Amino acid sequence: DVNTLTRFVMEEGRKARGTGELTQLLNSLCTAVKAISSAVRKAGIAHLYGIAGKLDVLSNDLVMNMLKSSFATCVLVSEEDKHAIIVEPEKRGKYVVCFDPLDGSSNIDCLVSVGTIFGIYRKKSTDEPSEKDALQPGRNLVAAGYALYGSATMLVLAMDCGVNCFMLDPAIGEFILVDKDVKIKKKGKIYSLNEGYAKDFDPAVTEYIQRKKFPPDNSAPYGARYVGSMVADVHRTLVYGGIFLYPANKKSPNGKLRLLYECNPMAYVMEKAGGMATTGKEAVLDVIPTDIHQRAPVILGSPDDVLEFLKVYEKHS
Amino acid sequence: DVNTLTRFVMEEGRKARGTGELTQLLNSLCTAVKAISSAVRKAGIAHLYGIAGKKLDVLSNDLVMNMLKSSFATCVLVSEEDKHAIIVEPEKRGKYVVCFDPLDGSSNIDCLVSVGTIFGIYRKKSTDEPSEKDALQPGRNLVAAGYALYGSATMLVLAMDCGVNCFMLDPAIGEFILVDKDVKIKKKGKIYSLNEGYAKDFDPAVTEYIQRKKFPPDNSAPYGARYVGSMVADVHRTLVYGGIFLYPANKKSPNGKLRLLYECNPMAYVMEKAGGMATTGKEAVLDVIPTDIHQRAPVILGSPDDVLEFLKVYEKHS
Amino acid sequence: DVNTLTRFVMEEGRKARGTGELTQLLNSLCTAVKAISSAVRKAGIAHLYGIAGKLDVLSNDLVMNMLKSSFATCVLVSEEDKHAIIVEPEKRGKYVVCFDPLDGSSNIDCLVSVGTIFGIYRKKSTDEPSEKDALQPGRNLVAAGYALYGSATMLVLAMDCGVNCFMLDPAIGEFILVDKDVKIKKKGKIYSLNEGYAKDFDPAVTEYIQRKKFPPDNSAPYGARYVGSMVADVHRTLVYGGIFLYPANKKSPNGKLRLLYECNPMAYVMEKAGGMATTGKEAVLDVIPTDIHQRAPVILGSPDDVLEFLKVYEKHS
Amino acid sequence: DVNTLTRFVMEEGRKARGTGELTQLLNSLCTAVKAISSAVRKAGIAHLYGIAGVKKLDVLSNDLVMNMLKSSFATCVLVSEEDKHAIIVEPEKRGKYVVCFDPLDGSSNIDCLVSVGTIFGIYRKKSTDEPSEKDALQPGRNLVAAGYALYGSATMLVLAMDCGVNCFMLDPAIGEFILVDKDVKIKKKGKIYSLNEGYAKDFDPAVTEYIQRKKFPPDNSAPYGARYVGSMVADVHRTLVYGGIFLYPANKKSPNGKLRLLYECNPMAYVMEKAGGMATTGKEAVLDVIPTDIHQRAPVILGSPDDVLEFLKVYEKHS
Ligand SMILES: O=C(NCCCCCCNC(=O)NS(=O)(=O)c1cccc(Cl)c1)NS(=O)(=O)c1cccc(Cl)c1
Ligand SMILES: O=C(NCCCCCCNC(=O)NS(=O)(=O)c1cccc(Cl)c1)NS(=O)(=O)c1cccc(Cl)c1
């Protein structure tokens, strides 16, 4: 049977005998993603260039507005907003959403792949909503994922039931379930990080990357890929296996990527897909944040690859 | 004034007082590229998954082949997808030779990586009956070349004698909009792009040059690295931001990995028209004389200062 | 606040504290309509004409398949199928759907507006489902409406809460609520019927048409519009007011339009918008059908206009 | 072999060995029409309704056609339904063609999603004088090309030139007009008649009698069916495909009809005649009226020749 995102979420909600509030949220997000995809593909650009006589801000506006108007959210954290957004009372629901509306867009001039990342939490306390309701560890995630605006548009949705991949059919604006309950390879053959900053690498990073290019044994060296857009790199890691690194070093002891709307949703997708995601010192999903915009180093991907990195990492402890 | 692909090519053609034959070819290519873009974005995929109860690389080849054949402007067609050159049937024969990779990078499209179309256009040089040899011309002879990038958006980069022009596809109306005119690459970039996974097979010149980017001898800032692994995306980034792109030979590919006829030459021609460079290490890509339509070439291309810096390291190693 | 079809139906379902089975039906139907619209607009026509080297059947297949896979239906009545389709037990739900997948398509060669018409009944008994479960009067409808594929694509959905009109935004494949709680004008200035059958008209129809061209009260004559596609004519009637007539003639002594999947849903929509729909002798919605494909004469539209027809009809006994 | 509007126009131009200036015109027009179609289909309407936190379609359509034609470098004088005066193209953009167009005919009723369309007529500038309104005051006989885009269940561009009438279907997936009907000809006789019968009390006596013959045929033939969309492009296009007759005739209250000669009547008459049909005012061929005002009206009766002939015979019967 053909299965859409709308039908999938609705069928999971009836299975779980829920009220439908999470389904209203995910439906709203899905609508926002189709609008971002349409703008990312430059629909209407002819009207900008005079046929009849910013993108990350629009994406933020689409996500913020679809989420607020879903009546399912109370606190919204965006990479684009300095403070947490508090949903007005008449629209308040029980969920906290952290999102990067258009991750990687700083390089969209080269039409590089871009994406939207989101993580959904349940509001934990009965207190008035505030920034603190978004300061939960990734362990508490209800749902997380990303939309990849790549050669095609794909939404990856991770929940307790696993990870599911929905392809956007632009002809009809429907997300078609094309990969059910996806699992990452136990071990990959690709590593992904920016080697241009090699001189600032932690010694453990230097050694682990050196083993990937010059394996001690007779196995094939890994291939290298680094798109520079986290959603693109993580998705390839999910599909092909391997390891993605943005680790800590002395000049950036906390990594560079952000915990709430980059690392945690990707770590959560990875763990639901049978992968791993660590900072080097602990699982990403176990970091308890103190700032909505705090940074986290992240090493994620195939479990065997991530375990091997941690082995090199403790060696240098 | 708004400018489209269809308007731009027609206006260059009237300037040159041509017959319109190259415009008919380029229109056909443009139409095929919009069909490929539409398919690459998975329009109609719901019907594939049973909403009512051909691999993409094969479809893309078919779109280019058929639009080019029926354009009446071509006589010989070389595609990455076909072992032998395609000879256009007599009644449809025109004067141009086209080498193209219909869906470059498609082997990894499962991860939705950017993919692209690359093309190079030659005038058939000899009066012999059309054959594979008509496509064995050095890149210096190119009439026009470029690529379509199916990335976050779909962009056609078209290079001719008049320079490099970038057209953005407006999906809402199926029109290519001129968005960057007479494009020029930076004299020097800050990004280097290659698969460092083959570091154990790198020739000493490549090894030293990469060492200079991460550990600059002059205590300037190291370059950033990017590598999509899809040639059109990496070359286009190099064009837009500057820098250097390397795909040198390795043990698995002693004559390089990339193809001369429908990957290296068109990108080399786009780069040289954009004030960039493209070398194999020993000579300009555009100066290689091909002997086999599918032959491979090592390629280093991008900002002139960076490529010259590589060549100086290359000369240091004899 | 922006509102979609999916958001609207879901929030009405939560208001009613229903199981969600009707929402899955409408979601399925909405997906079918976007697919028909894209096909009606000739998306992909280039591939038919050889770029790389029946429409009424497709529409039926899309509706049949989306309704079956919603798990909400048990009996399906279509203009394209002689007998009712009985949903197989594993996909069986509680709703009975009568639909015209592509009304007006016999003249689609001239690109006339076409549409999809649907009526939704709840199955009443615990007997095994059969054709007779579709033999209910229009009074029993739970929901009804139509999709109009005209200059743009619009879904008009009628339920107990009223009529709501959603415009399809093709850029994102979303139905946007653009007209809430629609009500038809008390009286219009347009009458709509095939005057080519004037030689076969009942005397009351003959007199009523004379009144539109030669008004007894010295008011301005009505204009005439007749697209020949029922969804196009009825929707104009809804938007501008007036009256639409398909009365009996010699080739169609019981009228031509079908009661179950043309007359009843339009009659239900009109009554929910404050209009009327009659056969001349009784309300359309009160006819008890004995055949899934049986015909009905139908006069519908603005109440004052239809009441004026009933006045002329009553004059002729 | 698949054929698009872009290939078809380029192939006819090379045959005719033209400079390509008309091809640039038609290409610009085609681009304007795809933008109109996209807007008419309500692409982006979600942004009007607040999805992220604005001219009528007839104003935008006029803006699209004007700008694409101006910037084609192929036009000098432009006549639009939306402008009282003709537009004189600035010198640096000036070409040799005069275009009369209705940017979105039928749009006053677009609230009900009725079919709408764009109609155009293209002339060569005749005189060596500085371009002015006078250059659009040519009879329909002088048309180089004419046609319409129908935004109906699908979008179709009907392009008529000396070589005949060709129908191109718009494929939205790729924004290409695909040639689907070559060198189309209308039926010799149809079975549909098309006019607003609500104004019957104002009908000319010939119109009353001819419509009476369609509903009550004297010779025991079948009565005609009636269709009236109220949007001219839809009614004419149905007339072209199915045959029959379309009437917007003169009456006592409107001695010149209601439709406009320059950008509505002439192009439909030109399409009809290239398709082997007819179009008359009752008194002469539409294409033979010599206009004196760019916005002047003309009565039009068009469609299958036999149906039009039967109309003219009844019209002549009434002196
Ligand atoms: O629609 C109806 N009711 C609203 C839907 C109720 C819940 C159904 C599904 N549950 C759910 O989604 N739960 S959850 O928490 O979001 C969740 C939980 C876990 C994972 C996920 Cl992914 C989501 N009723 S009705 O009869 O159809 C009706 C009645 C009148 C008018 C209409 Cl128009 C329709
Ligand atoms: O169309 C017409 N003629 C055909 C077009 C002539 C070519 C004009 C432009 N030349 C050109 O593009 N040359 S080139 O070699 O391809 C070249 C050269 C250099 C760079 C590039 Cl990019 C391309 N005539 S017409 O009056 O419009 C006409 C007449 C009858 C019916 C119609 Cl429908 C239209």
DSSP string, C40-100: HTTTTHHHHTTTT--HHHHHHHHHHHHHHHTT-EEEEEETT-SSPEEPPGGGB-SEEEEEE
| Coil vs helix vs strand at A283 | strand
Residue B191, H or E segment: strand B191-193
DSSP element (H, E) containing A61: helix A55-68
Report which secondary-structure segment, H or E, holds A146: strand A141-149
Regarding beta strands D145-151 and A141-149, do their DSSP bridges make them parallel or antiparallel, or are they unpaired? unpaired
Rounded CA-CA distance C285/C267 in Å is 7
Q: Which CATH number fits domain A182-316: 1.10.260.40, 3.40.50.300, 2.30.29.30, 3.40.190.80?
A: 3.40.190.80
Give the number of residues written for chain D. Answer: 319
- Residue A19 C-alpha, separation from nearest chain B C-alpha, in angstroms: 28
Rounded Cα distance, B273 and D138, in Å = 48
Which residue's alpha carbon is at the smallest distance from atom 5 of ligand 1?
C20
Residue A298: name the closest of A290, A260, A312 by CA: A260
Asked whether the beta carbons of C91 and C110 are under 8 A apart, the reply is: no
For residue C43, give every residue at least 6 positions away whose Cβ sits within 8 Å of its Cβ, in sequence order, or none.
A171, B43, B44, D171, D172, D173
- The closest-lying atom of ligand 2 relative to the alpha carbon of residue B162 is 20
**Do the bridges between strand B74-79 and strand B86-87 make them parallel or antiparallel, or are there none, so unpaired?**
antiparallel
Report the SS3 class of residue D144.
Answer: coil
Nearest C-alpha neighbor of C301 from the set C272, C270, C280: C270
* CA C103 – CA D287 distance, rounded (Å): 38
Determine whether the interchain pair D223/C194 forms a contact, defined as Cβ–Cβ distance below 8 Å: no
C-alpha C233, offset from chain centre? 11
Cβ(A308)–Cβ(A217) below 8 Å: no
For chain B, list the contacting chains (3+ Cβ pairs, <8 Å): A, C, D
Do C264 and C98 contact (CB within 8 A), yes or no? yes
DSSP C115-182: EEEEEEEE---SSPP-GGGG---GGGEEEEEEEEESSSEEEEEEETTEEEEEEEETTTTEEEEEE-S-
* DSSP letters spanning D63-92: HHHHHHHHTTT-EEEEEETT-SSPEEPPGG
3-state secondary structure of D12: helix
Query: Torsions phi, psi of B100, nearest 5?
Result: -145, 150
Distance of alpha carbon A169 from alpha carbon A34, whole angstroms: 10
Backbone angles phi, psi at B93, to 5 degrees: -75, 130
Protein residue whose Cα sits closest to atom 22 of ligand 2: B9
Beta pairing class for C95-103 and C85-86: unpaired
CB atoms within 10 A of CB C4: 25
Angle at D284 between CA D282 and CA D290, to 5 degrees: 125
Question: How many whole angstroms separate alpha carbon D224 and alpha carbon D221?
Answer: 9
3-state helix, strand, coil in chain A (%, to 5): 40, 25, 35
CA distance D254 to A37: 53
Triad C173, C174, C179: Cα angle to 5°: 140
- The SS3 call for residue D4 is strand
Please tell me the distance from the alpha carbon of residue B274 to that of residue B238, in angstroms, as a whole number: 11
In whole angstroms, give the CA distance from residue C187 to residue C209.
Answer: 16
Q: How many CB atoms lie within 10 A of CB B131?
A: 14
CA distance A41 to A33: 12
Residue in chain A closest to D64 (alpha carbons) equals A52
Contact D41, D4 (CB under 8 A): no
Helix axes A230-240, A264-272, angle to 10 degrees: 10
Quick check: do C1-181 and C182-316 share a fold?
no
Put the strands of the sheet holding D155-161 in their side by side order.
Answer: D87-88, D75-80, D94-105, D116-124, D145-151, D155-161, D164-171, D176-181
* Spatial CA neighbour of B194 closest among B154, B223, B159: B223
Give chain C's length: 317
The Cα B216–Cα B209 span in angstroms is 10
Pair C284, C298: CB distance under 8 Å: yes
A86/A82 Cα distance (integer angstroms): 12
d(CA A298, CA A245): 6
D154 touches chain B (CB under 8 A): no
Phi, then psi, of A23 in degrees rounded to 5: -60, -40
State the amino acid at position A126 in one-letter form: T
Q: What is each CA distance from A270 to A236, A299, A308, A313, in whole angstroms? A: 12, 11, 16, 20
Chain D residues within 8 A of A32 when measuring between CB atoms? 51
SS3 state of residue A244: strand
Question: Count of residues for chain B?
Answer: 318
Go through chain A and tell me how many residues it has: 317
The neighbouring-strand residues paired with B86 are: B77
Do residues C231 and C148 make contact, with C-beta atoms less than 8 angstroms apart?
Answer: yes
Question: Which H helix or E strand runs over B176?
Answer: strand B175-180
Distance (Å, whole) CA B66 – CA B87: 12
Q: Both tokens of residue A215?
A: 């394996």
**Amino acid (one-letter) located at B158:** L
- Identify whether the C-beta of residue A134 lies closer than 8 Å to the C-beta of residue A75: yes
- Phi, psi (deg, nearest 5) at residue C31: -60, -45
- Strand ranges, E, within chain D: 75-80, 87-88, 94-105, 116-124, 145-151, 155-161, 164-171, 176-181, 192-194, 225-226, 245-248, 278-280, 300-303
Quote the DSSP letter at residue B284: B
C-alpha closest to that of D187 among D239, D236, D140, D246: D239
Q: Two tokens at B100?
A: 């193209």
Angle C55-69/C21-40 helices, nearest 10 degrees?
A: 160
Take residue B202 and report the two structure tokens written for it.
């790198």
User: How far, in Å, is the centroid of ligand 2 from the Cα of B262?
Assistant: 27
**Which CATH fold would you assign to the domain D1-183?**
Fructose-1,6-Bisphosphatase; Chain A, domain 1 (3.30.540)
Best residue for ligand 1 mutational test, from A22, A70, A95, A141 (most atoms within 8 Å of Cβ): A22
* CA–CA distance, A110 with A47 (Å, rounded to integer): 21
Chain breaks in chain C (C to N over 2.5 A) after: 53
H helix intervals, A157-263 = 203-213, 230-240
State whether residue A76 is helix, strand or coil: strand
Distance in angstroms (rounded) separating the CA atoms of residues D14 and D17: 5
- What gap in Å lies between CA B302 and CA B271, rounded to an integer? 7
The helix (H) or strand (E) run that includes residue B245 is strand B244-247
Distance from CA of A179 to the nearest CA of C (A): 18
Torsion of Cα atoms, C47 then C49 then C54 then C59, to 10°:
30
Burial (CB count <10 Å: 0-12, 13-18, 19+), residue B318: exposed
Beta bridge mates, D118: D149
Report residue A176 as tokens: 């078609």
Both tokens of residue A254?
A: 């906390």
Q: Residue A162: which H helix or E strand, with range?
A: strand A162-169
Residue identified by tokens 């000809």 is D185
The DSSP code for D134 is: G
* Residue (of C228, C236, C234) closest to C256 by Cα position: C228
Alpha carbon of D8 to ligand 2 centroid (Å):
12
Q: Quick one: which of B130, B135, B118 has its CA closest to B29? A: B118
CB pairs under 8 A between B and D: 82
Sequence-distant (≥ 6) Cβ neighbours of residue C307 within 8 angstroms:
C276
Minimum Cα–Cα distance from A42: chain C residue: C171
Q: For the packed helices B5-15 and D21-40, what is the interaxial angle rounded to 10 degrees?
A: 170
Reported as type and span, the H/E element at residue A176 is strand A174-179
- Token pair recorded at residue B69: 């054949």
Closest C-alpha residue for ligand 1 atom 30: C13
Identify the experimental approach: X-ray
Q: Which of A132, A169, A222, A186 is CA-nearest to residue A34? A: A169
Q: Which residue positions of A form the known binding site for Mg(2+)?
A: 79, 100, 102-103, 262
Q: Map residue C262 onto helix, strand or coil.
A: helix
DSSP D154: S
Q: Cα(A275)–Cα(A277) distance, rounded to whole angstroms?
A: 7
Distance A70 CA to ligand 1 centre (A): 14
Dig out the tokens for B82 from the structure. Answer: 């076909």
Where do the structural domains in chain C lie, given as residue ranges? 1-181, 182-316
Separation CA D25–CA A51 (nearest Å): 15
Closest chain D CA to residue C194? D226
- Looking at the CA of C158, which ligand is closest? 1
Q: How many other C-beta atoms can be found within 10 angstroms of the C-beta atom of residue B140?
A: 15
Q: By CB neighbour count within 10 A (0-12 exposed, 13-18 middle, 19+ buried), where does A80 fall?
A: middle
DSSP state of A88: P
> Which of D46, D64, D173 lies closest to A51 in CB terms?
D64
Residues B254 and B248: their CA atoms lie apart, in Å, by 9
Structure tokens at A119: 């993580």
Cβ neighbours around D247 below 10 Å, total = 24
Spelled out in words, what is the top-level CATH class assigned to the domain D184-318? alpha beta
Q: Is C187 annotated as a binding residue?
A: no
CA distance linking residue D259 with residue D295, whole number of Å: 9
Residue A177 pairs in a beta bridge with: A166
Gap between the Cα atoms of C130 and D268, Å rounded: 53
Residue (of D16, D266, D268, D297) closest to D141 by Cα position = D266
Query: Which ligand has an atom closest to residue D16 CA?
Result: 2
Read off the tokens for A177.
Answer: 């379930």
What are B281-285's contacts with CB under 8 Å, separation 24+?
Answer: B281/B205, B281/B248, B281/B311, B281/B314, B285/B139, B285/B260
Residue ID of nearest Cα to ligand 2 atom 5:
D20
Q: How many CB atoms lie within 10 A of CB C113?
A: 30
Q: Which two tokens stand for residue B38?
A: 């539409």
**B248 phi/psi in degrees, rounded to 5:** -85, 170
Q: What is the CATH number of domain C1-181?
A: 3.30.540.10
Going by the DSSP 8-state scheme, the letter that residue B221 receives in this structure is: P
CB distance A234 to A184 below 8 Å: no
d(CA B7, CA D233): 28
d(CA C171, CA C149): 16
| A51/D66 CB distance under 8 A | no
Angle at B286 between CA B280 and CA B291, to 5 degrees: 85
Both tokens of residue C252?
């169609």
State if residue D20 touches ligand 2 by the CB under 6 angstroms criterion.
yes
Strands D155-161 and B296-297, by their bridges, are unpaired
CA C115/CA C154 separation, integer angstroms: 9
CA distance D223 to D211: 10
Nearest by CB to C4, from A11, A31, A37: name it: A31
Cα distances from B260 to residues B61, B67, C297, in angstroms, run: 18, 23, 72
Looking at the DSSP assignment, which residues form a beta bridge with residue B4?
A: B177
The resolution of the experimental structure, rounded to one decimal in Å, is 2.4
Q: Copy the structure tokens of residue D287.
A: 């294409």
Q: Is the distance from the beta carbon of residue D162 to the nearest atom of ligand 2 less than 6 Å?
A: no
| Dihedral of alpha carbons A235, A236, A242, A246, sign | negative
Within a 10 A sphere around the Cβ of C131, how many other Cβ atoms? 14
For residues B192 and B225, what is the distance between their CA atoms, to the nearest angstrom?
Answer: 5
Q: Which residues contact B102 (CB under 8 A, 6 or more apart)?
A: B36, B57, B60, B61, B63, B64, B79, B80, B81, B117
Q: Which ligand is in closest contact with the Cα of D17?
A: 2
| Residue of A37, A55, A58, A111 to mutate for B, most B C-beta atoms under 10 A | A111
- Residue B261's region, left for phi above 0, alpha for psi from -120 to 50, else beta, is alpha
Both structure tokens of B169: 């596809």
**The amino acid at B243:** G
The helix (H) or strand (E) run that includes residue B212 is helix B204-214
CATH architecture entry for B1-182: 2-Layer Sandwich (3.30)
B174–chain D Cβ distance below 8 A for any pair:
yes
CA gap B7, B158 in Å, rounded: 13
For C65, list phi and psi in degrees, rounded to 5: -75, -40
Q: Between 3.30.420.10, 3.40.710.10, 3.40.190.80, 3.90.960.10, what CATH number should domain B183-317 receive?
A: 3.40.190.80
